[PDB]
Amino acid sequence: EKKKSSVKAAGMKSILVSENKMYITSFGKGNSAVLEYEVDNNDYNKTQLSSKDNSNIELGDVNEVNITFSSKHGFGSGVEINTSNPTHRSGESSPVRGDMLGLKSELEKRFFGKTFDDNIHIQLIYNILDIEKILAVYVTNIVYALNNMLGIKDSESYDDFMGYLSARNTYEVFTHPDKSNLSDKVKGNIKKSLSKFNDLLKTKRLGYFGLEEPKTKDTRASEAYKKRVYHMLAIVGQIAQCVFHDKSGAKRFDLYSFINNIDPEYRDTLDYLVEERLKSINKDFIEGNKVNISLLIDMMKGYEADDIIRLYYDFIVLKSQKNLGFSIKKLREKMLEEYGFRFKDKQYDSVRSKMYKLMDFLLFCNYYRNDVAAGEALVRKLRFSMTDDEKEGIYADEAAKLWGKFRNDFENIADHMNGDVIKELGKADMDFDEKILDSEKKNASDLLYFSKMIYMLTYFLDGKEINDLLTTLISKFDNIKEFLKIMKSSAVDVECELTAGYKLFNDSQRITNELFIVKNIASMRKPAASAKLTMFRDALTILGIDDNITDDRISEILKLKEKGKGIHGLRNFITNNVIESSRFVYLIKYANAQKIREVAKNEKVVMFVLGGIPDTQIERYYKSCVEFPDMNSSLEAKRSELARMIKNISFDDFKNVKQQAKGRENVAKERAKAVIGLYLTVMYLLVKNLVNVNARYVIAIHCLERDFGLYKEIIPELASKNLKNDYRILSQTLCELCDDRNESSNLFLKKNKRLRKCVEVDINNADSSMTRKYANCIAHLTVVRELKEYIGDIRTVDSYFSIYHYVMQRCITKRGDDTKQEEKIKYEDDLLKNHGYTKDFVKALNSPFGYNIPRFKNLSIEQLFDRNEYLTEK
RNA sequence: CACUGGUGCAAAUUUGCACUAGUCUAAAACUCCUCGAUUACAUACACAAA
Ligand SMILES: [Mg+2]
Ligand SMILES: [Mg+2]
């Protein structure tokens, strides 16, 4: 069983090191740090900074090698914990640890204007680098999705569209480049992007993102919509220019300041988008939430109605229940599993979300207002826990106490969870003034432009993508705010003036809070799109249709241009089950409907995805999708059956479905919905996993360009080098320096001669041409684009990593039909014979990333790649 | 099945293993928030309708 660090469990958050002192911190609420002690490195004298009430740990003996301490709150019944004194390292003169890359001094100069004899500034800086790494993944995906949206399947060019946009050009300059005072090359570049912009508008595919063109054809409304879309694309392009380098090796330095420095029209667009979302939630919130609010007021006897309304607004928009230090949902889930299993019954499926909100709200109020001490006690037990099993036990014990307290309340909620009561509560008068929430309401004016810019990015993202980007940004800003607070403390008091480009980080507290709200509002369902003919073609094509069907034929089959009563059942069925599916939208955004349908014919690929689905879920899918299920068949037979259904699905299968189903018609309709849902889920899982694998490589490219720029300032040997000429130059130069010199900036290569020698072999196996192709394929999501072309050639489909590398290797070794015979790569012959990726080829391709050994090994060895795989063998 | 530090056995000129840490390693510091993830998520029961 994996065990946690006892040092973290006991309460020691961090040991900050300066040249003469160490500062020990303990965990406060959430990410807060409690300064506990200051220790002198030379004489080991200690001074307690914490008050008797605030202190969480007791410091014992401190010496050159070890630090002994114990919890003041009972961890391990007060057991003594021994941790290394961080200043004790052989072969290092300084008490202060350096970074593995050796870029700590260059980074401190870039962010703070000078070097420091402490390890605090570098920790804050690594948090900023993490923000850039995650933005690099999402902008790369968004740019690919926008290009993909065009439908130009055969196209050498890529960034003629997003690459030529600039946030420094207003909409007027963009639409009238000639009337500009810009260079002729620039004017032509703008025209190329303008033409692509009109191409994107013509597709009608922007509706997938919630960017619907206006219903009216009025010129004024049309231009206002186009201007907003242009601002969104130009901002995405600007972010891309800040996290990736251009042809000349240059990148913009205004990522954190540009939004406040560009034309005010861009800021108007950001306000318009956020105001639209906030105004829909905020307008008549009490009337909009009257059913739950009425039930809660009747149920919560110890609270004033106005207080409940304010708490409910918090629960929906602020989601304070998600900042408690434990999972409210997990507690509710444990309560239902052990004691309220009846509420998990099929009859509550239609009202389950409402029922869970009411149950979660009671638990939230219990810990947020009524029993804050119980919440603090629960966090301490979870922090003290050393294993996953212990943590589950803590949630289970808490659920048992909660059931005794809320059993009657939960039964009461379940009694009201039916259509008759809900319809009744909906029609009932709600005499509460909407102005009660004026003090709690969140408005667009309350947020920074940086926060609004992040909200704008969410239009292009799926809920999982929003969760991944936002939770990562929130965590990094929270860490940065804490590091600044520690450095500015009376006890530490070290200079930390950020340079002009990074002044935004001074507002890291406010940004962390605003970003949390952005995650909540961005995660909410947007109004359904007006389905356009393009979407209907996408839906019929993904299901399976004649390759040469005309737009007029699609209109005819779905009666799109026909007016009448009850004649649109098929159109409505396709809209509800395909067009409105987030899984379908994800597939159209990153893939091609016709290509995905062809990939679905490959039973080995579909069986691989089905294999990952839990056995209980396969049984549910088998029962819902198969008309006459053989329940006595094996799980492999059931998976094999579902794979055959997916291979044979077509639009034709659903042409007679009855959308307004009566009686027995319902059985066929439910089965059709189940089959479409499984088909979309299986294809979505495959594409999403490949996009996710690609993201790891995108981080590697972003880091290599960033690291090359930093190393270039301190390595004379890199002085005349251009990275794009040969991507292997950083690893090659650093490996050579380790062999020929004594001093080394890069510790990964210097410390591990065996791994350094391995990287040297991998560099030699590669060349400038193949590495350049790899970087281009990673940046353009070529593996996802060309998946249908090569996935069929894989003999055994056993991992996302192996699928990605096989397709990538086929793309790299493809001999251009337009170009002449080029230096055939030495791995091509075996790859074509093997029908599987070549392990040595991955290492050669990844040789540019060799300077960061953990990244290089994780990206080159299938067993080390995924943190969620090989848990038992790990 | 990683990387780096400390400690402890071993080991000449390769280092290896064990225990333990690390926000200054890797998508990677505790509790959260997340992801894996499919069972779904989502200010408005569901269904139908526009
Ligand atoms: Mg030393
Ligand atoms: Mg880190």
Numbering used by the authors: 49 to 922
What does the published report state?
Cas13d is a class 2 type VI-D CRISPR-Cas RNA-guided RNase. Cas13 family is the only family of class 2 Cas enzymes known to exclusively target single-stranded RNA. Analogously to the other members of the Cas13 superfamily, Cas13d also contains two R-X4-H HEPN motifs, but bears little overall similarity to the amino acid sequences of Cas13a and Cas13b. Owing to its biochemical properties, especially small size, lack of constraints on the target flanking sequences, and highly efficient and specific target RNA cleavage, Cas13d is a promising candidate for RNA engineering and editing.
The binary complex was obtained by the selenomethionine (SeMet)-derived UrCas13d (R288A/R823A) mutant co-expressed with CRISPR RNA in vivo. The SeMet-labeled structure was subsequently used as a model to solve the crystal structure of the unlabeled UrCas13d (R288A/R823A) binary complex at 1.86 Å resolution using the molecular replacement method. A mature 50-nt crRNA was determined in the binary complex. It originated from an in vivo transcript encoded by a co-expressed CRISPR template, which was further processed by UrCas13d itself in E. coli cells. The crRNA consists of a 30-nt repeat region (C(-30)-C(-1)) and 20-nt spacer region (U(1)-A(20)). The high resolution of the binary complex unambiguously shows an octahedral-shaped electron density around the phosphate group of the nucleotide C(-7). Considering that Mg2+ and Na+ are metal ions provided in buffer systems during the purification and crystallization, a penta-hydrated Mg2+ was built into the present structure. Moreover, the (Mg(H2O)5)2+ ion forms hydrogen bonds with the phosphate groups of the nucleotides A(-5), A(-3), and A(-2), as well as the side chain of residue D178. In addition, a tetra-hydrated Mg2+ was found to coordinate with two backbone oxygen atoms of residues R137 and E140 from a loop region of NTD.
